[model samples]
Target: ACLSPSQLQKFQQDGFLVLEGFLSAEECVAMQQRIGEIVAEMDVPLHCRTEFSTQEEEQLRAQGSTDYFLSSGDKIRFFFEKGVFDEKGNFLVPPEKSINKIGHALHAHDPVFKSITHSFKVQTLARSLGLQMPVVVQSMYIFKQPHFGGEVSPHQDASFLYTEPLGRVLGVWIAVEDATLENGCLWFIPGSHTSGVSRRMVRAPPGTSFLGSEPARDNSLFVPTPVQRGALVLIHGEVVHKSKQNLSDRSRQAYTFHLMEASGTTWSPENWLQPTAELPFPQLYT
Candidate 1:
């Protein structure tokens, strides 16, 4: 059986859903251990070598000293190097038995994990919105620390996909570690999907990406939601969402998948840089 009637209804209404206790503590611990081993092999020589000096400079800057200097290494290099698996020299699943077992466990727990390359849920959601067939796309994991900070600017998922009739894309974010505010949980604007707002990019400072546009002044609607570990959050491509900076001492880890209907390839690395005309005023549709 699929989800219950009420569960389906909630998903339809909220444009998102949270399934809790989807994984046990043992499972979480095991997965973490496997991931740790894989991450250990990452060549973070620059990160390790620069940490001490960078921290000293950061402290000096915090104290209002004008003599502070910043490191010139690429700040977003982590994303290109470790975040997306589509790139070369990136670490996929390790060959160790434990890593293989973790992958097997994930697939067993969520059928979506096994067939992410051809997820029915993504296709069904696209069809519901009158979209053409969507393609099951890539997936990645997030392991955040107290300050495992990164800026996922507020933008519609469609903005990244570059597809026509943008609302057909879907994204799933699953918490492997408890995602709390202090640990950089995701935030979304309620009902922003119906607003049909044009995408705008805000220049992100160092260590961040472009920030998405904001609602018009007259738009008096917004809500922030936080999801917990072992829970999954389903987001419509058009919904506006962003990630907060982790402020706590503990780390936050999560996995995410991006899916597009198979009709046409609207989203690509090239299209992400294209600019669109802005609407004069924001449309308010709750």
Candidate 2:
């Protein structure tokens, strides 16, 4: 009911698909408000909140796993962009000025986020895309605000979210605001998945924990992908994609979640994210 044969073919060939007007105006607005409310309750100022712990992240990398931070399986977490603070360690801008993003588990912790993650609409999308046993393991809300959004370097999801054998991981990116060239929109190389996953991030003597990994080849097929508010973009695990920093004054917010084949998908203790003892991966099908 979601995709025709040709539509499915296009997805297999393009490595990504942009679905316009997937979320109604009301739907998108509601989620945006919900996120605002969730972040509003934090007692600590955004500046005081633990954005990133360089020491903790480094230690995790030394252990060859980025799992230390990815361990927040059911809690809301915030991440900061570079250059937000001046040399004196004082905030150069106000707290609400911008946020790099928040994530790793919005779907598991927020009621509204959880509902959408398991909605029938999402399940139908899975079926059309050949995703069986889809289990949403992680979700993120990226605040790509103008003049402060950070650049997301080209990367594949598999490096950070790995499975023993190959697992089908699909990323559903919803645009809560208009995404365009000036404001930094998602971009990808057409048919890049044909070469499969290029490199794996690893903890090696030559490389540090978080960043040590094989390198990606120069993919020249990169194409700019922009979407209007309330649209959705589907990304394959092997897709090579990146987003630029927002240069415009408008804000670009997106709600994205990663779903993978859950049946026997062995996420090694060292591979990053694993289910918390209290809550497991949210199943997507009967």
Candidate 3:
């Protein structure tokens, strides 16, 4: 089994579990190298360049409704950092380091990411998590680049990937680079999953919008979770989590994918991400 009984107990209590060295250092390097190539080959036109920012609701509303953002669910796309562009739309930093993340799809299309998403470790983890039939929903490669990595406000994963029965989404976060306190490591509220899905990002006709407001979480109750390269963290869907901006010199690069149970749940059509006819949700195992 990929997880121990005690480890499972911890996850049940804390809404997240850190597994040190869950992946080989070599494997992490491979993924990072692949991501580098993907970034280098990227060609984001000026018109399609949307700045990704989640620090405020207005920022999300401003960018989340764009075709470039709304239709990214079935493809790999680059999202630039909020402060990377000047008034004339020129890049403020080096082109390569301006991206905030590459997201919505990677595991289904990229060979390296697909292999990892379907690896034995992931299948075993699905079983350990008690998912009868897990469908790989979406994936992201976050680049918490120094000085520009934007703050991710406190929110729940289910807000974006809400299911029918709710709390069915499982997030697998793998740290390719060391996530340190200085480099914007994730912070979570202990046992917050029990609070249920507090909000959701639903389809509002023309585009997407947040359905409910985020609950105020105590700052003192949140704890930073720093993990080294090759480590993995499991996140419960309803857990309230956020990360600070990366102001340090180091970048905390990480890859994450969300898996939802397919056995007894219906994926919300009102969710921002929807299954396309060409790129339907892929199952990890039959």
Candidate 4:
């Protein structure tokens, strides 16, 4: 799971990198089984299999769908109805305990992840950007399917962590299932991280906003690297990236971790979860 020189260069140039076979087949199977069992026990709808086409979609039907689960408007409702938070907007871990545990375990297992946090390449970059002791802000698993694709509107991760100085937030996306274009793999514009675009909010179809905006004509040149069950993709907080729809019937499950320097002073209990308000958009074409 060591990064090749070419891969490291690409990461430096593009603000993201991908590596294959970071997790073994056996490990993936075991984790998937655990996820299935947890979902069943919690009665959480598997968004990948359900048909949640509209706002009227059943709560169970919306469970795993991309837009439904992460929707800003719906998040408020989910927080109260599902009792996922306290009166002060602090998260209550009872319903999310098992899921969080799985995330922690996945982070513990990945050597590449350890390297990213500790490696000289990443550390140097952080230091150059004046970041110190980047903390793990949040980690969660996503189970997506063609039928239940989620839309992650393009937005800077820094917008959600405003209290901290900019340029220190990082995110890691690990594939739990094979991430393919048909099943909504991630796409990013090279070097968008330095563009300094402000995050934006737009009207999105139920499953359409996953990957921010559509790639510009020239930005169409993208690297569609397949992430195996254990492979991971790391990106800067401001990199322009988003998920595609899973046109294939198979589901794409992945895990993401948001990391930030602990010294940034941008800690918020509410921001720990999804954003509730609509955000301003970054300039799509520059």
Candidate 5:
């Protein structure tokens, strides 16, 4: 149910760990079906269809603080892939396939996602890692759609969900489909979290502001992490990780969310996603 001592050590040293078959095949299938329904019922207007991209530093600095995205911390929302739209913003590909992710609050509101997010297994893992009062802050159902899933540039989770006395965040990513090398499997730079967070995504007027320059990723150092369906990957908040575009025929679908300590750490006021009075970040364990 929880990480063993050796597995915890590996996570600390490598900044990432893979747990095979953390979710059952039935559970993974349920997630896929839930996401399908979500997509089918979505009727996003053209102006709301923001193209998500991590490839450029400018896009990173700009997109996170929009009223739509900021407010979405408590609501489910859709983000589209770049280059999938015409100059006029018309969909060039099938609408369902153009989405990059359905994000930010699915773990809080979706039944299937909520059960998995607050499951005993997740709680035990957080406690084993010494995360006192672990609270889920954000979530996403990343659809690395075949042929056009965009490349996500290397980044550290703490940059966006910065906590006071940083490095308290961890990402729990569960593969809903087989994340093969041909599809977009996550890549990590071993032990990169040792460097600490170099930049921050803080709250700004029009959108989020960047406090530091964009990171330069060394492709040679990246280790590909290809996992089978139902596997779970734990990522250190400060670790540099990225995923390539899904050029293969396979779709790399995954459910991911971040957890941060509620007892000792301070949630950054300037952080893009903030807890609201009506909807606070739920603790992983009661």
Candidate 6:
């Protein structure tokens, strides 16, 4: 399941790796159906807007802090795309199109999502990347629903999933449906990690704060990263990457999770998303 020396070298340098057909179509459907079941059962009329104000951010941030409430990182929850709702807070589009992603912490809750989140395949690849103990700190299902899917600005993962030192965090993105150029496939800048992590996303007290966007500079190297259904995309946390708006008439669904070096890294309480202190981000294997 691990990449060869050359592929690994390229991945390290390019900031991404694409593994085609890593999961079967049937397997992908099973998880995709699981999401359908989730949305049907949760029955939330109002959804979160990913690009909303700090007021919305504070609500979701507090949601992540409590077990009583379902947050993006606690159990399973829904997050909405920015501008998907109106002034009255009713969904401006269909509820399905309004959801930005369902995530934060599924591996520690749903047994079905857990199965794929820490599959042996990810374990092998993670070890190949040099993490002896890869702990899953976050997981989510991203739904780029038709034309309503919003554009995610280019940003680095380390800005949000920050660690003390660099070169620790990694992301595994599994496509549940075909990721096409028109439907918002991921994009990345090759060799962007060489610049090192230039920004950070912190909260307060033990840390600082940032919104995670970069100063406008050269974007000459940006390119599309289209992957087929049932495939996996590996991402380095420091890699500058993002996806475009889904302009097509179809949905592009993908499942993703993040891992960090649990043994060598520290989970400071200062990190905004880790609101529950040094817990919930359970280890996958040691």
Candidate 4 per-residue lDDT, tens place, 1-286, comes to 4565686677768888776765567656665675666455554334422334456555544444445444432121111122333443333443433132233322333444333334454445445445556655555567663454554544456555433445666776768788876777887777877755454332342332222333343437544656768776777777777666556777787766666666645554334233333422111111
Overall local distance difference test of candidate 5: 0.86
* 1 versus 2: better TM-score goes to: 2
How well is each residue in 217-286 modelled by candidate 2, as lDDT tens digits?
A: 5746679988899898988888888998888898888999999887666764555566777778878774
> Residue 86: error of model 6 in Å?
1.5
| Candidate 4 stretches greater than 4 Å from native | 1-6, 44-132, 200-223, 264-286
* TM-score, structure 5 vs. true: 0.92
Model 5 alpha-carbon drift over 4 Å, by segment: 46-65
Total clashes for model 4: 15
lDDT of 6 by residue, 185-218 (tens): 9999887876666666766653345754585646
TM-scores of all predicted structures: 0.58, 0.85, 0.92, 0.58, 0.92, 0.86
Candidate 6 whole-model C-alpha lDDT, 0 to 1:
0.76
- lDDT of candidate 4 at residue 102, scale 0 to 100: 31
* lDDT digits (tens) for residues 205-273 of candidate 1: 322233355544322243555656666677877777777666677767776656556555444333322
Against the unseen true structure, what C-alpha lDDT does each candidate score?
0.49, 0.74, 0.86, 0.53, 0.86, 0.76
Query: lDDT tens string, model 5, 1-286?
Result: 6889999999999999999989899989999999999999998743545554435633543444366677889989888886787644467877787889888989889999999888888888788899888888999999999888888999999989998887788899999999988899999999999877888889875567799966777699999999999999999999899999999987899999999888879998899999988769988886
Prediction 2 global C-alpha lDDT: 0.74
Worst 10 contiguous positions by lDDT, candidate 2: 60-69
Q: What TM-score quantifies how close candidate 4 is to the native fold?
A: 0.58
lDDT of 5 at 125: 78
Candidate 1, which segments miss by more than 4 Å at Cα?
Answer: 45-134, 200-222, 264-269, 272-286
C-alpha root-mean-square deviation, each candidate: 11.9, 4.2, 3.8, 11.1, 4.1, 4.3
